[PDB]
Amino acid sequence: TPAHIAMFSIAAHGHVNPSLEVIRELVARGHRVTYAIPPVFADKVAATGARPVLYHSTLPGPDADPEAWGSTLLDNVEPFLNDAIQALPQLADAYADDIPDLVLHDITSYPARVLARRWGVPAVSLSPNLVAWKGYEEEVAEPMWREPRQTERGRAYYARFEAWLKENGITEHPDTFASHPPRSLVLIPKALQPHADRVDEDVYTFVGACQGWQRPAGAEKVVLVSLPAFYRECVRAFGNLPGWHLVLQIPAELGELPDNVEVHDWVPQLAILRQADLFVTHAGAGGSQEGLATATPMIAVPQAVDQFGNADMLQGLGVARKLATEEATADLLRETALALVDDPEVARRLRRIQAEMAQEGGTRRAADLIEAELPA
Ligand code: NA
Missing domain, CATH: 3.40.50.2000 (Glycogen Phosphorylase B;)
Structure with missing residues (x-):
């Protein structure tokens, strides 16, 4: 029946x-x-x-x-x-x-x-x-x-x-x-x-x-990095940056970790993104989608051609910056991160897209x- x-x-x-x-x-x-x-x-x-x-x-x-x-x-x-x-x-x-x-x-x-x-x-x-x-x-x-x-x-x-x-x-x-x-x-x-x-x-x-996952008290901006030298650039980028807290999904070749950095082999991504202010991502579907769904701006670090596609789309939407792994160094990561989390227009665009997705x-x-x- x-x-x-x-x-x-x-x-x-x-x-x-x-x-x-x-x-x-x-x-x-x-x-x-x-x-x-x-x-x-x-x-x-x-x-x-x-x-x-x-x-x-x-x-x-x-x-x-x-x-x-x-x-x-x-x-x-x-x-x-x-x-x-x-x-x-x-x-x-x-x-x-x-x-x-x-x-x-x-x-x-x-x-x-x-x-x-x-x-x-x-x-x-x-x-x-x-x-x-x-x-x-x-x-x-x-x-x-x-x-x-x-x-x-x-x-x-x-x-x-x-x-x-x-x-x-x-x-x-x-x-x-x-x-x-x-x-x-x-x-x-x-x-x-x-x-x-x-x-x-x-x-x-x-x-x-x-x-x-719970946001640490005192954390004013939370950054999730999910999917070597690149992880160490992220540590240098966000480590001891005032008000920031870095969640690194990667494993002891990162060097000594500052107090505002936590490292996991696996994390509840969507749960963190709900409490995160920035997402450093490879920009595959799913990651791109969860970033948008949680109105979280992104640093897209694509590698596999389609990701270059998602990344250009995200950057085209004005809610992410696309970076090559050659550019993906501490100074540029930090600069990009500060610029994205502080931009009220990025936030407004994310709210728009999030609303469109709901529809x-x-x-x-x-x-x-x-x-x-x-x-x-
Ligand atoms: Na978020």
């Missing part, structure tokens, strides 16, 4: 954590939720109340080095196809006698898309990062693929992808299949989406609200929108 919603993802934190609360909420509303997942994340998934449906994925495990996921475009993308080809039959079999009413999936799951179509039920894509805007194909996708696509390997990748879709009754081009879902909930704030003005809001809905809604709204897709 309860509707059966089948969620699909892979064993990667960034492709599971962002929708965990949505899944929990759907279970709380009485829906029967199953969640296709590799065994390493069975416990994680079961904790939401959803039933794990186990399958073997050939993608790197959640603890693998980022290098394992590849350095080139083809190296990054082929694994998702290879995985999908071998995962599809496993999942088809697992669900054969219990076809769901609706398919939910993280963007990485090609099998979810295929099965939704095979089963004749709606699919809802859940994006943990930015989505395509109108013009993306000409502006980003085509230029990006222009060279690899014309190589032998590239031609054979796309040939293989087309054939696989053809074997499952799909005639959409693989680029459409992969990058252009019919319906998507975007789990990042619109503020972190490039060209958000050209995103098709009949397809995509931004639901980026941040639905997902997007998060968990409750996402669950509503998923229910609205129940062919019902």
Whole structure:
């Protein structure tokens, strides 16, 4: 009698954590939720109340080095196809006698898309990062693929992808299949989406609200640094700076610590950000999102190209300064920190963005929108 919603993802934190609360909420509303997942994340998934449906994925495990996921475009993308080809039959079999009413999936799951179509039920894509805007194909996708696509390997990748879709009754081009879902909930704030003005809001809905430690007395400004020489620059930057208190998430090669510095291997990030006045971050999604949700200005120290994207966005919003690790020295860190925490306009902008995020809604709204897709 309860509707059966089948969620699909892979064993990667960034492709599971962002929708965990949505899944929990759907279970709380009485829906029967199953969640296709590799065994390493069975416990994680079961904790939401959803039933794990186990399958073997050939993608790197959640603890693998980022290098394992590849350095080139083809190296990054082929694994998702290879995985999908071998995962599809496993999942088809697992669900054969219990076809769901609706398919939910993280963007990485090609099998979810295929099965939704095979089963004749709606699919809802859940994006943990930015989505395509109108013009993306000409502006980003085509230029990006222009060279690899014309190589032998590239031609054979796309040939293989087309054939696989053809074997499952799909005639959409693989680029459409992969990058252009019919319906998507975007789990990042619109503020972190490039060209958000050209995103098709009949397809995509931004639901980026941040639905997902004690400040020392005498601390007038609290700075959290989260994700060597850089940590020591931070110690020199904030150590014994009057009124400041530094929380360093990093481990005895930092040297002697001043009294206003505390170091942890792990910290409750969101809990500290609620009581923090500055956040030094690598500017991945999540970090960027929690900074905005807590109206905490940021020093963005990006390294992995997308972070350079988030960082430029944040800096474009006037709520962060982007620094290279070459610039990330004590004097510049301190100067930047003083300038950001003392700027009433930075604070005003953060309040605006925080309010916009609240309006997007998060968990409750996402669950509503998923229910609205129940062919019902
Ligand atoms: Na804050």
